[PDB]
Symmetry: D2
Subunit: 294 residues, 4 copies
Amino acid sequence: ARVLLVIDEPHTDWAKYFKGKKIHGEIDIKVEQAEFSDLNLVAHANGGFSVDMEVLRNGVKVVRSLKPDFVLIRQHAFSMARNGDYRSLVIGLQYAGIPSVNSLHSVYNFCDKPWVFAQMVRLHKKLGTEEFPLIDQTFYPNHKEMLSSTTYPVVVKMGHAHSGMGKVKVDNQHDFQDIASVVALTKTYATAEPFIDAKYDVRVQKIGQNYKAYMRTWKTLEQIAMSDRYKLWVDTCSEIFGGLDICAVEALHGKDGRDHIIEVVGSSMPLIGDHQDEDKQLIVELVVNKMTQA
Amino acid sequence: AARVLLVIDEPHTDWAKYFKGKKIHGEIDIKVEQAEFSDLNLVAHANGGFSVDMEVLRNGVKVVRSLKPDFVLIRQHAFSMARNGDYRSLVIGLQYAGIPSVNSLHSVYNFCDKPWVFAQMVRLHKKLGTEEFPLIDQTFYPNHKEMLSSTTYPVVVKMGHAHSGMGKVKVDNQHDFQDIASVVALTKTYATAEPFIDAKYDVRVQKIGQNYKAYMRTWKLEQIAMSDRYKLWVDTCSEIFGGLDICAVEALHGKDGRDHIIEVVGSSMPLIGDHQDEDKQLIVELVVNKMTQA
Amino acid sequence: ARVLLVIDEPHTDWAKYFKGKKIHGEIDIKVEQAEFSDLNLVAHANGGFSVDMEVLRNGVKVVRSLKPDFVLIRQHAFSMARNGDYRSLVIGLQYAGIPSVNSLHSVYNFCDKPWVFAQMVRLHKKLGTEEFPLIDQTFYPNHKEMLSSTTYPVVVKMGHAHSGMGKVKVDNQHDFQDIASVVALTKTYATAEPFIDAKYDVRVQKIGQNYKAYMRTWKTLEQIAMSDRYKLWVDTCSEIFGGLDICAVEALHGKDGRDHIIEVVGSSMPLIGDHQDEDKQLIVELVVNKMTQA
Amino acid sequence: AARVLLVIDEPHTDWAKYFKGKKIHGEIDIKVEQAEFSDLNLVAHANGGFSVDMEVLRNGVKVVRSLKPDFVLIRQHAFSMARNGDYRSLVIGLQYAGIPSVNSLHSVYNFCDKPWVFAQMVRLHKKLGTEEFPLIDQTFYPNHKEMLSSTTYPVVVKMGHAHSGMGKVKVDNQHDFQDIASVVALTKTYATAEPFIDAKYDVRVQKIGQNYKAYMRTWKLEQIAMSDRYKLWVDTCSEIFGGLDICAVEALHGKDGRDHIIEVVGSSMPLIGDHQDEDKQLIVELVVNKMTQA
Ligand SMILES: Nc1ncnc2c1ncn2[C@@H]1O[C@H](COP(=O)(O)OP(=O)(O)OP(=O)(O)O)[C@@H](O)[C@H]1O
Ligand SMILES: Nc1ncnc2c1ncn2[C@@H]1O[C@H](COP(=O)(O)OP(=O)(O)OP(=O)(O)O)[C@@H](O)[C@H]1O
Ligand SMILES: Nc1ncnc2c1ncn2[C@@H]1O[C@H](COP(=O)(O)OP(=O)(O)OP(=O)(O)O)[C@@H](O)[C@H]1O
Ligand SMILES: Nc1ncnc2c1ncn2[C@@H]1O[C@H](COP(=O)(O)OP(=O)(O)OP(=O)(O)O)[C@@H](O)[C@H]1O
Ligand SMILES: [Ca+2]
Ligand SMILES: [Ca+2]
Ligand SMILES: [Ca+2]
Ligand SMILES: [Ca+2]
């Protein structure tokens, strides 16, 4: 039986979602699940390797080792918040040669938001604003370059973090200077972009060959029909770093009728709307299909 | 043989000139070496041996001068959470070597966490009461997780340990407070929140040895007469951590007539007003007296 | 009833050890226990404050808040190992004005081993080697000063860590250089001291007015009679940073008959030998006595 | 108008002199700006605008020169875990700005974690086999907790990501391995362990564009003829991360006749031997050709 390690929080019972799924209608799939914080590993160039997972057995913490044949990463591999760095585990998994969704290569390169955004910048130069309306954004390697903004208000996004973390709205120059000094204390990079007075925002997702668009109506659901414009946004983004099996594009719709793409997320993208259960099943088949190629 | 005094301060002030002619016991001369924390390193041995190394430029080449200070005057901040502002190990090394200092190395070390210093002031307020020691209301958060709200707005949030306005922001409402806490998380350190004071002017009461002065500066200059009120503020504060030879107390004077003590500063306090020259001579006198005792 | 917060691992049931103890034979003591990693807090200058403890209730993680009237710290407040920094909690407790054993002031100043060692260096200059045989040791603020050792082998101790962590034996110059480069990666201070070929080592402890000496026979019990020589070692060390209620002195006995004091530990000192249960009871009375003064 | 080339390298080499006279399409001139990572900063905008700022000394004052490179040649390491050796955000910024480079910014970024690079070599060994690609046996540890033992001694432990011998130690036995792991914990990063090779000599096979050279250096120099064996090592490695215009493979030759590939280097590879001058001209040629394509 093939062993699948799924790195996600306990809320979703992936074992139950993969129950009965087989590779070539004959080989069974054993699902192992845990969060990055409860994992460790050792990998050898000769191919030998082990993944150690801390779990609870009869009220006591124990370590059980496994050897995944495949991995599904649903959690962020990196966050500049304390204790949120698991890049070394991603490196170890690649070192062990274990296949993954999304690919370990893409997961590693997704560990710096501005690095991913740089990929969108290139796509925007290539496609033009009409087809790919990337929001204006400025990147500062560190606080020394954060002197001013030519327009206000702007949204400052500090380092690499998720779920609203490290993000603030700045209304004037004096406050921008105060915020830049806070960036100094984070000792990392930051970006600034025009604040969009949004009527609503839109997220276009792509799991395998399945698409869905959702309208979400400052720091914040109804589904909407896919359009070829939306399809292009996510299709082109899904091509970076060798290809993203699970990804989505976030855009803000201004009260002036303009769209502004502000981010592309990877295999850790949250499932939203009234069809989350369906999305999990779609993820299962994609994983199953990917595992079949081995 | 002359007694060597190391002054840690920027070059602007020529302490050698100010100490020129000064003698210990009217016979022993004083040799003045001066450098900034960034130009220093050292090695100390439990047996008493040590060397304070000063990096200097010679014939366009980086060379090192080895000194054995008999005493040290510290005029720069020993710590800042901004990149490369950490000189705590030098303070540790100077104490390891047993070198006497102004202010004391013990107090300098304990002054490296603003809230730790504020904690002493909290104790003094509990003891003396509001009328005599009007300490501003303040809240300490070990980390961003406890920053949920503020009973009153606007507030001034001060992040970690930093100087010259760095990491200090004015928050006007609850939602903004939340966004600011999401950024505190990127600093990975503590923070405090205190009521924003609509000040009419702020006052700073300084004490150098036995010389007192008071200055009035009217959101981030006139000398005024000392009062027994002011004298009590600085006399009380000057006693913490075994005693501060040089220190000052900063208080904001609200428009409703209330005073709010917001900070106590050590030997790094900047010299201000039309008596800076006199203050420097006063420091010279204080140090020579401290040096005489050894 | 007075609330006592004991910060220690779960192995010891402090509630059971404090069961029945009363202040003035009438006031009861409610014992709360948890580790630094499961705690957080908020403190206000006006005296208001809360300590939040994460615990498990029916298999789920919950937060219950308390307001300790006193604290007993049996765990290290700082370790440079990942996620081992709880200095901000110690700062918060002092900010809230909560009494402790050992004192919060001493616990804070014990967060840098070389800073504590500097205190022993001063005691050695004062008492002399015959009475206080402090081991030779060299302090490096950073790796740039770690060039060589005049004798080998030596023991290199990196940064601030416990239970053998960060400590290695270096036999020659080339290896010393390799180790110094490792120090560069820790980006912190380090010390080097002669390697003692020890017949055995000795630890002299002092809990309140109770003393005990233990012989422990490279990186490693039988009790031994207190002597006035041993008593002097711990008595003098127990006086630093305003006084240590719980502390011990570690010394190595060379095969050449010389003793070498290498460290002084605080209220987190481990209980050893066949009288640990007794030591816990002695700790209880000291705490009870200390609490009675409030 | 001339095309601007920014060379990131130490001053020792005068790339302006080597590029002097070179022209793109025989008509367009090349302007050479040169600086070290430590002297650079930048700001990049999604709209294409950007500025690479070079700090320089003018009339004894620190001033900034703003440049807009059309291409960049990177000859220095972009990352080191030693204090202030982190220039990853500059690499991110140069890509954000869309500036073409040698080696590619993508490969430079992915080369910032030695084991991540080694993981690619692991893959190549699995594919080509030992006879053609003799990759040394190596073990990857995400952190110190998994470092428990080594099947064979002595071993060479390499900590985190650093250069010029930094963080690399030779361990001769099990107990020492444990002590070394206790220090890895202070580095708070990953480490690898590989068999110590009792080498007779080591070889480095380099590839600059289409020019190959091989050098023999006989525990931490003669040119030899290229072989199809050597050509295959560097040709294979030169293909990772989309292709390496400049790279080299380091292999240790054991006394038992076995070869052990221990490392692949990128555009920062030092120039060695009696053909350094020629190698520089070869790099000039390679860059001019890459610049011609734009
Ligand atoms: N330029 C902007 N103008 C207006 N609102 C913005 C802007 N950027 C972000 N926001 C708001 O802030 C929210 C959070 O920001 P964003 O989506 O960039 O970060 P995040 O959700 O923390 O990122 P991650 O996907 O890593 O979790 C957005 O969903 C949106 O409501
Ligand atoms: N609660 C407050 N209300 C209004 N203004 C404040 C308040 N706290 C600080 N300020 C203003 O900010 C200025 C600087 O803040 P503060 O003195 O606390 O820090 P700092 O100057 O950065 O510290 P340091 O003295 O270390 O350099 C004060 O002089 C005052 O003008
Ligand atoms: N100079 C030395 N010579 C020989 N052995 C030494 C020396 N220093 C330490 N050791 C050995 O290493 C052990 C651990 O070192 P040490 O006691 O200094 O650190 P630790 O126990 O990690 O400190 P902590 O008390 O913070 O837990 C000692 O108990 C002793 O066996
Ligand atoms: N397994 C090994 N056995 C014996 N010697 C080794 C081994 N690994 C490395 N060395 C020696 O150490 C030298 C330097 O190590 P290595 O090239 O791995 O790192 P480095 O030079 O620090 O890295 P970089 O190339 O980034 O600067 C090698 O040239 C070789 O002489
Ligand atoms: Ca988002
Ligand atoms: Ca101030
Ligand atoms: Ca010890
Ligand atoms: Ca090398």
